[PDB]
Each structure stands twice: as structure tokens, then as C-alpha cells.
């Protein structure tokens, strides 16, 4: 039931499964490729407060994995470390063979706690989490991934940075996030913020020196009138 795309040249058609189509050619298996695409390429929102609303927990359903040979570069990748309130892990350790997605402009690393009702975290729209050369139905702990889909087509004849967040209520609808600048220094995270904005704020804070230099923590709140980027 899996469709294949056929590229005649620049022209792409979905293969007709029932028709013979003597026109179509396949000379070797090297013309058959599994390519992964990111959901960000379809314009889905990528900020942390919105991306987590597409993920959730379920029990009683095992994970599945497929491979892909090529894929695109992601502007926004995610990496989760979520614990239950009592310290138990929410996400399973990745099995060997799983490695993080190879090319990300930014990695949004979110650590924190929250209720985790299920056995695994699954994508709610049915998308796959993309790992090194593997697409998975579930999220594995500590490993960088991108959200995406796999196409299956027949062919014609690095510096990156990390943005850290800390959160509570990870698995629920009403949650809170802070952007980490230093161990004691935080910024309230808004849904209107872009990766570029947060990085500019990180430079502003270290440069001005307005960081916590005591034993407690500081949280900066953004003035709603200053725009972002």
C-alpha cells in the first residue's frame, strides 16, 4: 500500500500501482531511495512552546523504526531529557544503532519534569522522529532529532549551536518554559521568540553583565513592546 514517486526528469508522478506502465524503468536498486523530509519545510511552527503540543504519551503500543538514506538539513532539532516528579525517567534510553540527526542549525535541548502517563512519547499527527538514518515512531532519551516524513522514490536513469530550556509540566497542556542563559540566569520563554532572538539576548546579558552573581536565581521577563527579530 506504500506509494512510490517516479521522477522522469524534473517531472514527478505518483506511480500507478495497478498499471503496468512499460514506460517506467529500473536498472538497479541504486535508483531506489528512501528520503526523509522535515515538517518545518511545510511551515509548521517550530518554537518550543508549540512543538511540544504535538507530542504526547501513550501506553500499550510498541515502537517501530524504518531507515532512510538521505534527508535534508534542519533549522530546528530537538533533544529531550524529561523526568517524572520522583526522578524516574520518562523516555527510554536509545538502543544501540541510534545516533542523533547529523545536521542542525540549532538544537533545542529541553530538560525538565512532567507527568508521563504512557510508556513512550508518540507523535500526534503520525509524523516520525528522525534520527541519524532512522525514522522512529517514538522519542528516545537524550538523542537529537527532527520531525518529519519518508517519501520512497525512483530516481531518473559543521558548526551548530545549542539553546537550552528548562521546563515543568512537560507532558501536559498548561506548561512553563524558561530559557537558560547561565546556571542561575533565566529568561521567561515566549511563543513569539525565534532562535535568533534568544541568541541575541544571551549576548546582551553576558555583555551587560546582568546575570545572577549571588546564590539565588534571576528570571528576566521580556518587555512586550520590544519586538523580537
Amino acid at each position: 500500500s506504500i506509494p512510490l514517486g517516479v521522477i522522469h526528469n524534473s517531472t514527478l508522478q505518483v506511480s500507478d500501482v495497478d498499471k503496468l506502465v512499460c514506460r517506467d524503468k529500473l536498472s538497479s536498486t541504486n535508483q531506489l531511495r528512501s528520503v526523509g523530509l522535515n515538517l518545518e519545510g511545510n511551515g509548521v511552527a517550530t518554537d518550543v512552546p508549540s512543538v511540544t503540543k504535538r507530542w504526547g504519551f501513550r501506553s500499550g503500543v510498541p515502537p517501530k523504526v524504518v531507515n532512510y538514506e538521505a534527508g535534508e538539513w534542519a533549522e530546528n532539532c530537538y533533544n529531550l531529557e524529561i523526568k517524572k516528579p520522583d526522578g524516574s525517567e520518562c523516555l527510554p534510553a536509545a538502543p544501540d544503532g541510534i545516533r542523533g540527526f547529523p545536521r542542525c542549525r540549532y538544537v533545542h535541548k529541553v530538560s525538565g519534569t512532567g507527568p508521563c502517563a504512557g510508556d513512550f512519547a508518540f507523535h500526534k499527527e503520525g509524523a516520525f522522529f528522525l534520527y541519524d538514518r532512522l525514522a522512529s515512531t517514538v522519542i528516545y532519551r537524550g538523542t537529537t532529532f527532527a520531525e518529519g516524513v519518508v517519501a520512497f522514490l525512483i530516481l531518473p536513469q559543521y558548526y551548530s549551536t545549542t539553546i537550552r530550556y528548562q521546563a515543568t509540566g512537560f507532558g501536559t497542556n498548561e506548561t512553563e518554559y524558561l530559557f537558560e542563559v547561565d546556571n542561575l540566569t533565566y529568561v521567561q520563554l515566549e511563543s513569539r521568540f525565534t532562535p535568533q532572538f534568544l541568541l541575541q539576548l544571551n549576548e546582551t546579558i553576558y555583555a551587560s553583565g546582568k546575570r545572577s552573581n549571588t546564590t539565588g536565581k534571576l528570571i528576566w521577563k521580556v518587555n512586550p513592546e520590544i519586538d523580537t527579530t
Epitope: 525538565g112 519534569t113 546564590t215 539565588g216 536565581k217 534571576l218 528570571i219 528576566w220 521577563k221 518587555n223
Partner: antibody, heavy 133, light 108 residues
Framework: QVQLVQSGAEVKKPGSSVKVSCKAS????????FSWVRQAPGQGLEWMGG????????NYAQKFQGRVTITADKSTSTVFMELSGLRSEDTAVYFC??????????????????????????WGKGTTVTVSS | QIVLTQSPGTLSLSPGERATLSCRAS???????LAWYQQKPGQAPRLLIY???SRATGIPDRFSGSGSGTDFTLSISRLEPEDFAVYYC?????????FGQGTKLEIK
């Protein structure tokens, strides 16, 4: 007006631990700072340790490091404390308390708010814990 | 560590008489961040004053106080029968929060 509701009196045997709950009600966890204190009869009231749920972190007075664990769970609006290594010397009324963040520095970005354990405005009724056998 | 000492151990005063309570630190309290609380037997202490001079919410105007550096004072203009409590000073200007031993007001 915010209130703190604590569990009732308990009796533990020497060598065990006591878990005391404190429910936040009349408000929500928000960004408030919670702490626990201890007052043995005839003694003043000492800070044991505390938690700030929004970071999900806690710390302790040096005399209780390794003995006290403080946790919280947003979904039940509850702060919990556990005191281990119990001996009869530990008999005391244990209290939970809550206080505000203080306003900090201001810049063009926006305003800062400071989080540490300061003064307590809201107090629970106290849980009496006795250690004996 | 800022160590706080309060005095007198017990102030013996008639009802309606002015109460003066002293707290003295071994070290200055940053930002004059010292608080006072009123404790009754069987009850958690109620915050009366914080930040040396800021009156706490719901506290009667008969309660006052001031201070800076190491020297802080709480006073009650007329001590009512209901106010013959154990009073404590606490400092939060420097971590950890520390506190005095407490003093009592008693009826003469």
C-alpha cells in the same frame, strides 16, 4: 488569600524516615518559593531546606544535607518533604511556608525578579512528628 | 554567617504599656533585609515586618519598627493582651536565612 494545608501527626521508629505533605491551595504554585522549617519544643524555628518548583530544584541547610529531600508535583499542587535518619531528638512540629520573589534590576530588555528563600507570608498549621519505639 | 541576638529575654510589661524589642547582628544585614514574626503556642509565627521597616499584610498600625546595619528594633505602641507572644528576628539579606533565639513579652 493563599493557604497551606499540612498532613496530620505521625509517629516513626528510630532509623526510619517521615514524609510530610503540604498542599498549596487558595492559589496555585505559580512562581512562589516554598520552604520547610522545624521547631522542637522549647526551640526557635529553624530552616531545614526548601524548593522552588518552577526550576524543579531544592536545597538544604547543611545540617540536613543527606537527610532531607524536598520534591513537588504541580498536578496535585503539593510540596513534599522527607526527613531520614530519624531519632527521638527529631521530635518537632514541622511547618511548610511560602513567600514571594523579590523585585530585582531593570533594563531595556524588561524587568528581573529574584528567587531565593526570603521571608514567609503564608504558613501551614504544622505537622507534629514523634520518633519513638 | 550573620548571627542574630535578641533582648531582653523576657519583657515584663503591663497590658497597654509600650513594648520595645531589640535584635542585634554580628554582621551587617544587606539591604536591611530583616524580618520580625509573632508566635503563639501551638501556631506558626506570623510575619509582622520585613525589610526592616515594611509592615506585613493585615498587621495593625500599632506595630512598628526600623533598623539598618546590625541594629534593628520592633515596637508595639500599646501591647494588647493578644500580643503577649514570642517574637523573633530573621535575616534574609545574606544566605542562608538565619534567625535569633526569640524573646517573650509577658504580663506584669
Amino acid at each position: 488569600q493563599v493557604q497551606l494545608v499540612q498532613s496530620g501527626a505521625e509517629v516513626k521508629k528510630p532509623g526510619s524516615s517521615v514524609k510530610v505533605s503540604c498542599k498549596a491551595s487558595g492559589g496555585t504554585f505559580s512562581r512562589d518559593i516554598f520552604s520547610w522549617v522545624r521547631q522542637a519544643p522549647g526551640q526557635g524555628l529553624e530552616w531545614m531546606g526548601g524548593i522552588i518548583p518552577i526550576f524543579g530544584t531544592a536545597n538544604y541547610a547543611q545540617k540536613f544535607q543527606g537527610r532531607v529531600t524536598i520534591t513537588a508535583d504541580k498536578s496535585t499542587s503539593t510540596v513534599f518533604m522527607e526527613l531520614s535518619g530519624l531519632r527521638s531528638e527529631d521530635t518537632a512540629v514541622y511547618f511548610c511556608a511560602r513567600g514571594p520573589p523579590l523585585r530585582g534590576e531593570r533594563s531595556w530588555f524588561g524587568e528581573s525578579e529574584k528567587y531565593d528563600y526570603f521571608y514567609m507570608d503564608v504558613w501551614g498549621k504544622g505537622t507534629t512528628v514523634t520518633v519513638s519505639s | 554567617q550573620i548571627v542574630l541576638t535578641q533582648s531582653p529575654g523576657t519583657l515584663s510589661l503591663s497590658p497597654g504599656e509600650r513594648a520595645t524589642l531589640s535584635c542585634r547582628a554580628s554582621q551587617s544585614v544587606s539591604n536591611s533585609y530583616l524580618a520580625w514574626y509573632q508566635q503563639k503556642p501551638g501556631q506558626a509565627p506570623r510575619l509582622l515586618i520585613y525589610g526592616a521597616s515594611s509592615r506585613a499584610t493585615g498587621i495593625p498600625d500599632r506595630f512598628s519598627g526600623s533598623g539598618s546595619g546590625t541594629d534593628f528594633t520592633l515596637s508595639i505602641s500599646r501591647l494588647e493582651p493578644e500580643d503577649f507572644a514570642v517574637y523573633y528576628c530573621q535575616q534574609y539579606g545574606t544566605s542562608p536565612c538565619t534567625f535569633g533565639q526569640g524573646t517573650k513579652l509577658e504580663i506584669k
